[PDB]
mmCIF file of C-alpha atoms in Angstrom:
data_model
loop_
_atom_site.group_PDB
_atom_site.id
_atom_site.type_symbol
_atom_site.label_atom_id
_atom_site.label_comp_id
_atom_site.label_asym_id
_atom_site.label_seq_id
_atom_site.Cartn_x
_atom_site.Cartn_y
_atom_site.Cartn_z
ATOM 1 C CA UNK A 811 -200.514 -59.386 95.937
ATOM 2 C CA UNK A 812 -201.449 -56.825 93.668
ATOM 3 C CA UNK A 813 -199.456 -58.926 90.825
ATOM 4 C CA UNK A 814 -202.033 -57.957 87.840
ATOM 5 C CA UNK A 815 -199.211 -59.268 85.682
ATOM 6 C CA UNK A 816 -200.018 -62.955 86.631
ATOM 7 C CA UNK A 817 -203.914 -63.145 85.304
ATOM 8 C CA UNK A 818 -203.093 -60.999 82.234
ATOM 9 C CA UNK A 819 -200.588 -63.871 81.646
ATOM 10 C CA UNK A 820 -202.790 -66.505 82.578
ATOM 11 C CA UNK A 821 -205.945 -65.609 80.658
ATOM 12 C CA UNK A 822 -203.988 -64.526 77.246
ATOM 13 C CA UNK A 823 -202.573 -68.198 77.109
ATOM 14 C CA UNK A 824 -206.073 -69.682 78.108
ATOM 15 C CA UNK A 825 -208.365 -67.843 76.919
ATOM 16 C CA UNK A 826 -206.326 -66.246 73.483
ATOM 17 C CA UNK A 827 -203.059 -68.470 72.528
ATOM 18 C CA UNK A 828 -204.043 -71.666 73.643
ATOM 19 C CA UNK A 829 -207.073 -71.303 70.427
ATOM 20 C CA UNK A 830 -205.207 -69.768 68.080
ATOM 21 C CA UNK A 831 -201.887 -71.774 68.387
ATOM 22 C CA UNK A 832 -202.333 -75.454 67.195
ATOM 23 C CA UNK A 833 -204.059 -74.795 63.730
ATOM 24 C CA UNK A 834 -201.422 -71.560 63.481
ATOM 25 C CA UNK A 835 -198.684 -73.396 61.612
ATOM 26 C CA UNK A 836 -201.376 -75.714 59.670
ATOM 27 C CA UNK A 837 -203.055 -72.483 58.089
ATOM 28 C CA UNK A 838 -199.469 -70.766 57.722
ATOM 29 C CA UNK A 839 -198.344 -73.817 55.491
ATOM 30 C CA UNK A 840 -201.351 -73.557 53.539
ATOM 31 C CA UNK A 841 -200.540 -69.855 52.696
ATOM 32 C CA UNK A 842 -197.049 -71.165 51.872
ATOM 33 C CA UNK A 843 -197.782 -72.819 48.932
ATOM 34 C CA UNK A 844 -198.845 -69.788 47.042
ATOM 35 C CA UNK A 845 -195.948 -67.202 48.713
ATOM 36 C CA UNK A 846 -193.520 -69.823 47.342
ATOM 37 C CA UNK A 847 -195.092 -69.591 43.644
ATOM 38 C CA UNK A 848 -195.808 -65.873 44.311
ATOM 39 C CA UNK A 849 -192.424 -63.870 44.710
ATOM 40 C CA UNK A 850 -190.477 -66.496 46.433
ATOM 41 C CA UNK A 851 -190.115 -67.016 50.083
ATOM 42 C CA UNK A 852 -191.629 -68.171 52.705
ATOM 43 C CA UNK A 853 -193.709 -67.080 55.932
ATOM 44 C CA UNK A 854 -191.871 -68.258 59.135
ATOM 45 C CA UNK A 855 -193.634 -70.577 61.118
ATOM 46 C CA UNK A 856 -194.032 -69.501 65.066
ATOM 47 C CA UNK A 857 -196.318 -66.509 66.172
ATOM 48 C CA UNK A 858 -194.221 -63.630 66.829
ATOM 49 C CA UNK A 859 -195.460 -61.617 69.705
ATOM 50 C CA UNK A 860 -194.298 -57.939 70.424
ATOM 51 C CA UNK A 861 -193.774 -57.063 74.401
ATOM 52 C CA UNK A 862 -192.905 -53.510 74.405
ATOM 53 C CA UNK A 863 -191.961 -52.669 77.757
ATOM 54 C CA UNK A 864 -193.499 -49.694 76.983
ATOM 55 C CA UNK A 865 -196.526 -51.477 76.863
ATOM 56 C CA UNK A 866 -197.344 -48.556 73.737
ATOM 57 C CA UNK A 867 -199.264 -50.848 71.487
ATOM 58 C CA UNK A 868 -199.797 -48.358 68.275
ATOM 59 C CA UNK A 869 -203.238 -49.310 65.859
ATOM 60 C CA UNK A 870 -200.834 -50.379 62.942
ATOM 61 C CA UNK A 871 -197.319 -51.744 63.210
ATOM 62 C CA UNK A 872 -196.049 -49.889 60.380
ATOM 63 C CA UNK A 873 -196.494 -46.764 62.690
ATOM 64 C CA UNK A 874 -193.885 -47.975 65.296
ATOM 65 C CA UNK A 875 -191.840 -48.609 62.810
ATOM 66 C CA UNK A 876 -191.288 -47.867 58.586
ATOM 67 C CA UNK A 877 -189.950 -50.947 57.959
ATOM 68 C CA UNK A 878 -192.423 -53.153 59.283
ATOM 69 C CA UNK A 879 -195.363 -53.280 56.397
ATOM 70 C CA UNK A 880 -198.524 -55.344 56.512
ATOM 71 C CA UNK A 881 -198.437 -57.603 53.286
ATOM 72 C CA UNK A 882 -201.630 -59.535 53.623
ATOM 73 C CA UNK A 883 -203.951 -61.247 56.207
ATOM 74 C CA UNK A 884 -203.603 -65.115 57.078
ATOM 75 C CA UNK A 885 -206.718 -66.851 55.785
ATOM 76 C CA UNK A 886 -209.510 -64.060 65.114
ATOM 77 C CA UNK A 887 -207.767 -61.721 62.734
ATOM 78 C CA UNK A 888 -204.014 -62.717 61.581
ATOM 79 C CA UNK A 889 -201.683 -60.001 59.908
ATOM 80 C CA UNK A 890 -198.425 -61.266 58.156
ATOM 81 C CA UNK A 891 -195.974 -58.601 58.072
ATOM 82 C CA UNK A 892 -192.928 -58.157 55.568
ATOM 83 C CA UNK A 893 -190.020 -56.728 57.153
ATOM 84 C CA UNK A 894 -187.482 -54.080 55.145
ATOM 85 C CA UNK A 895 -184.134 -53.319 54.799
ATOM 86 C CA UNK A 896 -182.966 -50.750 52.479
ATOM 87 C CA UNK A 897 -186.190 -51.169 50.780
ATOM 88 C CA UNK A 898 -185.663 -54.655 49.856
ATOM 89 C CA UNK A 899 -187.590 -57.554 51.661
ATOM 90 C CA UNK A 900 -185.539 -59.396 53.866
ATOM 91 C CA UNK A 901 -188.341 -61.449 56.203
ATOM 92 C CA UNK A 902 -191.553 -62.376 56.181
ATOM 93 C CA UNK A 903 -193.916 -63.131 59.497
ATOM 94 C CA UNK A 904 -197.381 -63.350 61.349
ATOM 95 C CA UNK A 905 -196.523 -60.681 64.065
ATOM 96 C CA UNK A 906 -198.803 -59.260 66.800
ATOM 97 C CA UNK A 907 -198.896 -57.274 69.686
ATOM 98 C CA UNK A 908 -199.692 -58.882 73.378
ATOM 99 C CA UNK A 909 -202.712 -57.318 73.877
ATOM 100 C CA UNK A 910 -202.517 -57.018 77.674
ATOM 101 C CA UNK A 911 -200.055 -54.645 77.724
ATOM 102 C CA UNK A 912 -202.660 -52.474 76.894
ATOM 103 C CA UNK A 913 -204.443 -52.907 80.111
ATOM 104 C CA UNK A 914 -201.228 -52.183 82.078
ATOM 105 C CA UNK A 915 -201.285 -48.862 80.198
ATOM 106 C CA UNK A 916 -204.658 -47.907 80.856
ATOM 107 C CA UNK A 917 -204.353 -47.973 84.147
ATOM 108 C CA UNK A 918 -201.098 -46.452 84.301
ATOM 109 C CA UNK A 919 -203.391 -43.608 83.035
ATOM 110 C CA UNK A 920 -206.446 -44.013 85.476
ATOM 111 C CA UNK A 921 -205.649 -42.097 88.649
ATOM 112 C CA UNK A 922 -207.785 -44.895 91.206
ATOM 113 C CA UNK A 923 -205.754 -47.340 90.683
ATOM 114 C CA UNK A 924 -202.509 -46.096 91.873
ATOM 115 C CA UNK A 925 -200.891 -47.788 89.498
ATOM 116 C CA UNK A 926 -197.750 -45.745 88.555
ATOM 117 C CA UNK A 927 -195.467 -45.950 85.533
ATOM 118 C CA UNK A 928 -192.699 -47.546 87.807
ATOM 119 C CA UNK A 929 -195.207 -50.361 88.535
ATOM 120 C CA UNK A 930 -196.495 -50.986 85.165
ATOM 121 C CA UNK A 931 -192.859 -51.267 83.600
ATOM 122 C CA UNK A 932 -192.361 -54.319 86.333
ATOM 123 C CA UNK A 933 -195.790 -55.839 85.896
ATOM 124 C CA UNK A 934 -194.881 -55.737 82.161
ATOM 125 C CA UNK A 935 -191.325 -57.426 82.667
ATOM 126 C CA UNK A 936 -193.488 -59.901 84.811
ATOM 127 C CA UNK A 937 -196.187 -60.271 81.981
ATOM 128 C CA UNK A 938 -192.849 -61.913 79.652
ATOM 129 C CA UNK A 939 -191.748 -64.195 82.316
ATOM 130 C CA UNK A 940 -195.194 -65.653 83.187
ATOM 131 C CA UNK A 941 -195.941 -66.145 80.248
ATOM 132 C CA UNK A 942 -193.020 -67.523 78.747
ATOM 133 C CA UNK A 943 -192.778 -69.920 81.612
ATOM 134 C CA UNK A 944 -196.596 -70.875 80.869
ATOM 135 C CA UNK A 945 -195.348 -71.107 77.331
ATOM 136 C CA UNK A 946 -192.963 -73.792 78.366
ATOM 137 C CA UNK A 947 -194.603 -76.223 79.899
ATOM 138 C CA UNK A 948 -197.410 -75.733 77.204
ATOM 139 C CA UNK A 949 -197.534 -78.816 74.754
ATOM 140 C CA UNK A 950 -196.515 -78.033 71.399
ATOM 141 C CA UNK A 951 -198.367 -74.696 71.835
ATOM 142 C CA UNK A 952 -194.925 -73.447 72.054
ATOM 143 C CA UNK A 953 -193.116 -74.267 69.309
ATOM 144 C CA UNK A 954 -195.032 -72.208 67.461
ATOM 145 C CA UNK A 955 -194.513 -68.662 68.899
ATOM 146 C CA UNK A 956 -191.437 -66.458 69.829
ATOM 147 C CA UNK A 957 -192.426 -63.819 72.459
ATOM 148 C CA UNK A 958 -190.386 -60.695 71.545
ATOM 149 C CA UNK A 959 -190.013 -58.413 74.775
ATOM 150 C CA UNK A 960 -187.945 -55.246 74.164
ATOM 151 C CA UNK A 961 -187.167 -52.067 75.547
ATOM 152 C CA UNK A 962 -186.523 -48.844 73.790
ATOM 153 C CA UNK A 963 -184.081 -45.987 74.880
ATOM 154 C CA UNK A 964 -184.709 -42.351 75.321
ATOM 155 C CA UNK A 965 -182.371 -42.528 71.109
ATOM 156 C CA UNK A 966 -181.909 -45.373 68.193
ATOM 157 C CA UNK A 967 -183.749 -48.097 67.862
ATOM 158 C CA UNK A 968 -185.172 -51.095 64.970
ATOM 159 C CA UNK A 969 -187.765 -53.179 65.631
ATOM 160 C CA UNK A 970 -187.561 -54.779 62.316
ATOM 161 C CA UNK A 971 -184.273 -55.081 63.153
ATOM 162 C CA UNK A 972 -185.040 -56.922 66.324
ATOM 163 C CA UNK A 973 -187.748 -59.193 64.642
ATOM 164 C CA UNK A 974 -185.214 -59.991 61.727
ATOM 165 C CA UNK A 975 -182.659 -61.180 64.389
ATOM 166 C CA UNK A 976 -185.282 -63.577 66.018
ATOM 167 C CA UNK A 977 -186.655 -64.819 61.876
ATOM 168 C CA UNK A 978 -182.428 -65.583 60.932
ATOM 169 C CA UNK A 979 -181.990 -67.631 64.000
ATOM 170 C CA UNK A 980 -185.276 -69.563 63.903
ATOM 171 C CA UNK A 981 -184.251 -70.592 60.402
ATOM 172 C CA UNK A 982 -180.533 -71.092 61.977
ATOM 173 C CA UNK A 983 -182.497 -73.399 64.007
ATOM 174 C CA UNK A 984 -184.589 -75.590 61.435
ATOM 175 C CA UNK A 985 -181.749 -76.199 59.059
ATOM 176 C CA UNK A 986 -179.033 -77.298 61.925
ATOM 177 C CA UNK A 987 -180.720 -79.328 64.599
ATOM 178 C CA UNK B 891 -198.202 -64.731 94.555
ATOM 179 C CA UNK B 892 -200.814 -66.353 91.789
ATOM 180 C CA UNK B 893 -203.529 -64.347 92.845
ATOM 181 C CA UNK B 894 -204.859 -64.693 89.144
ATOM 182 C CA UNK B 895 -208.111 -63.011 89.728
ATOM 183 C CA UNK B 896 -205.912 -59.850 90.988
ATOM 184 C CA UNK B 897 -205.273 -59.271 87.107
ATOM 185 C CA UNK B 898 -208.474 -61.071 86.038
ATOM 186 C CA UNK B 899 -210.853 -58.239 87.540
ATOM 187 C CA UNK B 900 -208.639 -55.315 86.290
ATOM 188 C CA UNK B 901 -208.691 -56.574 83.057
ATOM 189 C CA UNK B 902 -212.298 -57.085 82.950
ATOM 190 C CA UNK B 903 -213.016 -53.564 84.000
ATOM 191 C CA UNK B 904 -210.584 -51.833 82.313
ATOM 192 C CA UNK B 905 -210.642 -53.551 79.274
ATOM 193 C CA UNK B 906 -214.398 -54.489 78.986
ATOM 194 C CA UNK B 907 -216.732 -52.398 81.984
ATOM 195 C CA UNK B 908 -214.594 -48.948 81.644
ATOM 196 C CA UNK B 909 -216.222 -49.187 77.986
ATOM 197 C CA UNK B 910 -219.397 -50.544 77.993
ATOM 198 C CA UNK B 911 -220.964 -48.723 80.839
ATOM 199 C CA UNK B 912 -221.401 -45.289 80.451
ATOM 200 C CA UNK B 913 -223.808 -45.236 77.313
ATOM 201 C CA UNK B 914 -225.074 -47.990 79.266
ATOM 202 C CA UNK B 915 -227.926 -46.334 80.934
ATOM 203 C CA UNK B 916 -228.459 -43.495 77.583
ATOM 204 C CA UNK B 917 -229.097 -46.620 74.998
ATOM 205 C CA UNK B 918 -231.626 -48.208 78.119
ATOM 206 C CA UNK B 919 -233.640 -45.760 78.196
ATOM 207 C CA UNK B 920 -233.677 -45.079 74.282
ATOM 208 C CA UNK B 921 -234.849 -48.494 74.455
ATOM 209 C CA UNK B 922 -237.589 -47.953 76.969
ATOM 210 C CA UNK B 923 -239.805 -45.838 75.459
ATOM 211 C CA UNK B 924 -241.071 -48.625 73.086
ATOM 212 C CA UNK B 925 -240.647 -51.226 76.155
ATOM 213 C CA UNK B 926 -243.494 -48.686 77.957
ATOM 214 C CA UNK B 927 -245.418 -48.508 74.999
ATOM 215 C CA UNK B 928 -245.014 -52.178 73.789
ATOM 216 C CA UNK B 929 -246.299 -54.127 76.368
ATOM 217 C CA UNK B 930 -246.085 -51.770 79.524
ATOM 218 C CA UNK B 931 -243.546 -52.024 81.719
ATOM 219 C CA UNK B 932 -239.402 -50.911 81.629
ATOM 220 C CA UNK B 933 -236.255 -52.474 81.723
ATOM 221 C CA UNK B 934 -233.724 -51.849 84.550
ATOM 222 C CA UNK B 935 -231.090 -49.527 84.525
ATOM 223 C CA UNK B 936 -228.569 -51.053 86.327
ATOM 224 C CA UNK B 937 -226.061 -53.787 84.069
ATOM 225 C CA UNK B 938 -226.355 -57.336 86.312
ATOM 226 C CA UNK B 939 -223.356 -59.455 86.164
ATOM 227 C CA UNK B 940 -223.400 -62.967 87.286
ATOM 228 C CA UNK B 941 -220.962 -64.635 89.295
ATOM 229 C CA UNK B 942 -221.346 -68.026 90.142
ATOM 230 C CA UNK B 943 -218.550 -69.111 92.313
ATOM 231 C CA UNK B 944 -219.193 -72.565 90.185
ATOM 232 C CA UNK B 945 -217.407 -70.787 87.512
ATOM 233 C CA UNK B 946 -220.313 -72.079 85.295
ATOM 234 C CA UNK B 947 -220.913 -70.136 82.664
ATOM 235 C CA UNK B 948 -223.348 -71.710 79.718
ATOM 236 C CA UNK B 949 -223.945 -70.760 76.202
ATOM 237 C CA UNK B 950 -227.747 -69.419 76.804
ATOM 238 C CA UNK B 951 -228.917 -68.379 80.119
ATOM 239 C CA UNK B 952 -232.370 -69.983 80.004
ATOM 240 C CA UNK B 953 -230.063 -73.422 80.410
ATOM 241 C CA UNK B 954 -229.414 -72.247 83.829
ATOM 242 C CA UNK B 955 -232.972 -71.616 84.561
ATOM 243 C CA UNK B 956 -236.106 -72.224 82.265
ATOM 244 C CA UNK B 957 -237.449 -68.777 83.959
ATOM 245 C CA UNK B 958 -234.417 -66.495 82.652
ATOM 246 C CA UNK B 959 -236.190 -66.306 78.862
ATOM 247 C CA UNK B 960 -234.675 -63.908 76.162
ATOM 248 C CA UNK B 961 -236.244 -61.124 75.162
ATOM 249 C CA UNK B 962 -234.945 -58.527 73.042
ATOM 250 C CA UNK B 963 -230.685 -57.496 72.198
ATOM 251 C CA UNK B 964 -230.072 -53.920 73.319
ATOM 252 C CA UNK B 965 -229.335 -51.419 70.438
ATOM 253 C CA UNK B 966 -220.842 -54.942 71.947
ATOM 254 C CA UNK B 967 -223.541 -57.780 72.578
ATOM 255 C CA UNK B 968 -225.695 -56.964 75.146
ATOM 256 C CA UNK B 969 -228.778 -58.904 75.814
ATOM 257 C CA UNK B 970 -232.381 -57.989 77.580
ATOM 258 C CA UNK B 971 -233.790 -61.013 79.378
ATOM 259 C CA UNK B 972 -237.211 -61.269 81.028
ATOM 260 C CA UNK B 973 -237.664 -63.397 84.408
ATOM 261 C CA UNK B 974 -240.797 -65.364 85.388
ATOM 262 C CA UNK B 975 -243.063 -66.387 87.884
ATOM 263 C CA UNK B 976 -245.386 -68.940 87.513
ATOM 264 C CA UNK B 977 -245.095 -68.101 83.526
ATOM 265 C CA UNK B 978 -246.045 -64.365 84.298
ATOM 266 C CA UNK B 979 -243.225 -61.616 83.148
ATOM 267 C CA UNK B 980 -241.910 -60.445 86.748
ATOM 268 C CA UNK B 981 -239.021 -58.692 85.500
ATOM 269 C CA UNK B 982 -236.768 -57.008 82.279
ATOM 270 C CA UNK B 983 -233.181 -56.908 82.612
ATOM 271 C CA UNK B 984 -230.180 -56.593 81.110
ATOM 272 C CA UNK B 985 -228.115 -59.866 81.988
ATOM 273 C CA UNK B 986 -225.053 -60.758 81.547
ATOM 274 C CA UNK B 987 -222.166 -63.718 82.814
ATOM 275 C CA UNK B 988 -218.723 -62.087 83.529
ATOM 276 C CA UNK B 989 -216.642 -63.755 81.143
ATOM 277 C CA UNK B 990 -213.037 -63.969 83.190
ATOM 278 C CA UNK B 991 -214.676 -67.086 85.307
ATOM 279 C CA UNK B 992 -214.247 -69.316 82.443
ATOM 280 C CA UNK B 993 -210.700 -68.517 82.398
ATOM 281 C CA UNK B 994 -210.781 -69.701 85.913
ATOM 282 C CA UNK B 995 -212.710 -72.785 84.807
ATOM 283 C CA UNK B 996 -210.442 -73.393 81.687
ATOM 284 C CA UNK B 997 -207.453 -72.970 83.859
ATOM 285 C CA UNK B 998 -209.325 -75.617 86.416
ATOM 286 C CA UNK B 999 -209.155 -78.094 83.786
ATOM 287 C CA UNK B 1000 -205.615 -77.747 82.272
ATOM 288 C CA UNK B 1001 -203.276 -79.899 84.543
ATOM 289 C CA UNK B 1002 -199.982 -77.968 83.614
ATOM 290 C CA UNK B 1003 -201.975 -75.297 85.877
ATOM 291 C CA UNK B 1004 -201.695 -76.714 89.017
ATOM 292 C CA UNK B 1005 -205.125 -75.030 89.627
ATOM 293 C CA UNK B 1006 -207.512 -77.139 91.727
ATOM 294 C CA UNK B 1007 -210.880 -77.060 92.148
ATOM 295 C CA UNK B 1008 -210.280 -75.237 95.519
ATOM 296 C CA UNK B 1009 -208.202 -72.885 94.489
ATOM 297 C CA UNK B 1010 -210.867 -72.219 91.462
ATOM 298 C CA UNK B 1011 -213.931 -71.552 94.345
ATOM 299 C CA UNK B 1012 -211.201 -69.335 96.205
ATOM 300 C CA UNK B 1013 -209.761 -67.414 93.519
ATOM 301 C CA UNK B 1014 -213.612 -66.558 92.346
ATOM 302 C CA UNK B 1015 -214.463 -65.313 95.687
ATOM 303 C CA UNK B 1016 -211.205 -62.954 95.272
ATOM 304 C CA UNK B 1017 -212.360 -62.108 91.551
ATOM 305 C CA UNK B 1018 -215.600 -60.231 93.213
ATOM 306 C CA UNK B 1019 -213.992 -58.876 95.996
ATOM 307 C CA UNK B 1020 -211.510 -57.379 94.310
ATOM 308 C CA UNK B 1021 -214.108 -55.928 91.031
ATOM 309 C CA UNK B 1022 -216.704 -54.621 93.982
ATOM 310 C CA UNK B 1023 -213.097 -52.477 95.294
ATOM 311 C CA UNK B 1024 -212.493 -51.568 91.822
ATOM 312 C CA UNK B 1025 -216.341 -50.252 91.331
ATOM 313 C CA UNK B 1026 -216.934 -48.855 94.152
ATOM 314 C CA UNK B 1027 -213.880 -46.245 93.430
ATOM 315 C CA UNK B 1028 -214.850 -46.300 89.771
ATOM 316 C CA UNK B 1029 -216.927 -42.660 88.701
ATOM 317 C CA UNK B 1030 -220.850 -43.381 88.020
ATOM 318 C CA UNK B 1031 -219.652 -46.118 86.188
ATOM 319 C CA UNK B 1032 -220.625 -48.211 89.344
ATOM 320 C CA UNK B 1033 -224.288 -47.285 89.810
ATOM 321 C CA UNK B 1034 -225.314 -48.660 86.615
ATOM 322 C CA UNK B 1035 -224.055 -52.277 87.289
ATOM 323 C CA UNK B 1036 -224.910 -54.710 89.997
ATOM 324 C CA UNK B 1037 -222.874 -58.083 91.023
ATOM 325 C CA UNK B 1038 -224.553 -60.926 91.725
ATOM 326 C CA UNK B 1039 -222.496 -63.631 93.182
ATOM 327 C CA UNK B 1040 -223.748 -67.029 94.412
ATOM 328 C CA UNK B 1041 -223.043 -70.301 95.442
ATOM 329 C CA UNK B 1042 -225.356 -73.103 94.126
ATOM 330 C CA UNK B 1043 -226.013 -76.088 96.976
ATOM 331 C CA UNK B 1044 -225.183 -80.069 96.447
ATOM 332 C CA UNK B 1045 -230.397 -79.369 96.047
ATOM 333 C CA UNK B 1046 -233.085 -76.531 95.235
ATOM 334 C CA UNK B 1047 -231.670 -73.031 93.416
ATOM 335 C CA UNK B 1048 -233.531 -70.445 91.623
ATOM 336 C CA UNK B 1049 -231.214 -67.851 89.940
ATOM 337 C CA UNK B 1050 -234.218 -66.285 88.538
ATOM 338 C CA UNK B 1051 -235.545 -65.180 92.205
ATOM 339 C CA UNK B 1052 -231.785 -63.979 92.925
ATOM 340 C CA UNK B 1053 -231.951 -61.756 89.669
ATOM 341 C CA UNK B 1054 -235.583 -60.613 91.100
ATOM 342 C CA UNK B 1055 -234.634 -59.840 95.009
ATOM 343 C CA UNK B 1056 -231.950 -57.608 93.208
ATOM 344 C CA UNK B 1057 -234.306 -55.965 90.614
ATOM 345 C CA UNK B 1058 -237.160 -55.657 93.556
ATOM 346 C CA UNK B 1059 -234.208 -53.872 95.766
ATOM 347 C CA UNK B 1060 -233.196 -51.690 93.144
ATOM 348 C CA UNK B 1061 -236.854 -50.365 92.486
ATOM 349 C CA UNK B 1062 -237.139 -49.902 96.403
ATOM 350 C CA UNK B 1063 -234.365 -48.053 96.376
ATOM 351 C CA UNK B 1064 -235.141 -45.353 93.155
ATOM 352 C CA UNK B 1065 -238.646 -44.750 94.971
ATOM 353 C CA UNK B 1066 -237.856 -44.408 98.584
ATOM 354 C CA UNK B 1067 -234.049 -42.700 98.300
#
């Protein structure tokens, strides 16, 4: 009851992920090739989804933060993303916000609703676990995305800092197991 | 508690209605100057959604009835459909399927779901419900859009006369009120 949280979750996996997902890794290993021969290293292979709990989904990533610059698109529209430290290049990923949170925020902001900001922080924490629970029972449409839910103080805070944690152990991952 | 449509219908309206509706009505009647003067006669003002409960929501709308034809896009895709009777033009419309029921019927076929077929008619039903609440609240931005819901028998159905009782009504109502 009044759990808006549940069809956000619901119709971003059916009616978003669930399309863009299986060819995802195909089209990122086809871009590989030529990131390899072009300054070497290589694009990881899941999604990477940003959940602010904010739900304050800026135009361009770079915005939220410096060391997050767009490096080229992925042959609807895909965006890989270098990520910096010290200036020098230190990860490399298809990143994205969840657009839904967007919706929570909007009508955070529109009065009729009665949607306060107390609510929309919970339906956003609800959002994650939805949809990561969707996520795993979802058939190799998994595999191929890390969902990234985060919340920032109010103050110091990286997000490149936070994606590059999630890249080094997803490469942990592939050369252990 | 999985009240999907809950989040379905604020999503829709927020993200999609909250947008497209209040140039709605400016960019009609732009349009209906040359509508009068081509062929006499004037489009509605009022944006008609369609609901089937079925969840049923085909590519072209003349597949769900030979006497919905196209006519004309509206000057972000919003088409102008005409209706007949007996092959005679009985009506000019603006027409348009509300998307989130395919997420319901996507989600109807996708076993992980647990989504039935009954739960699919039910959660529909809640769908409108819960966007006619949302409208009626919602600031002129409910006077220039209709919802048609309906239920197709198991078996004689013409969703061209439903669009027509609606724009007959509507004209009753602009000349009388």
């Amino acid at each position: 009851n009044f759990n808006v949280a549940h069809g956000l979750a619901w119709s971003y996996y059916i009616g978003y992920l669930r399309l863009i997902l299986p060819e995802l890794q195909a089209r990122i290993r086809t871009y590989n090739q030529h990131y390899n021969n072009l300054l070497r290293g290589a694009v990881s292979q899941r999604l990477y989804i940003l959940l602010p709990l904010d739900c304050g989904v800026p135009d361009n990533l770079s915005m939220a933060d410096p060391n997050i610059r767009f490096l080229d698109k992925l042959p609807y529209s895909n965006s890989i993303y270098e990520l910096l430290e010290n200036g020098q290049r230190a990860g490399t990923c298809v990143l994205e916000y969840a657009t839904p949170l967007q919706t929570l925020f909007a009508m955070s902001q529109y009065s009729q609703a009665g949607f306060s900001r107390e609510d929309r922080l919970e339906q956003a924490k609800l959002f994650c676990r939805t949809l990561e629970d969707i996520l795993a029972d979802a058939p190799e449409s998994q595999n191929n995305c890390r969902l990234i839910a985060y919340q920032e103080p109010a103050s110091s805070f990286s997000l490149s800092q936070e994606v590059l944690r999630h890249l080094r152990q997803e490469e942990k991952e592939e050369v252990t197991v």
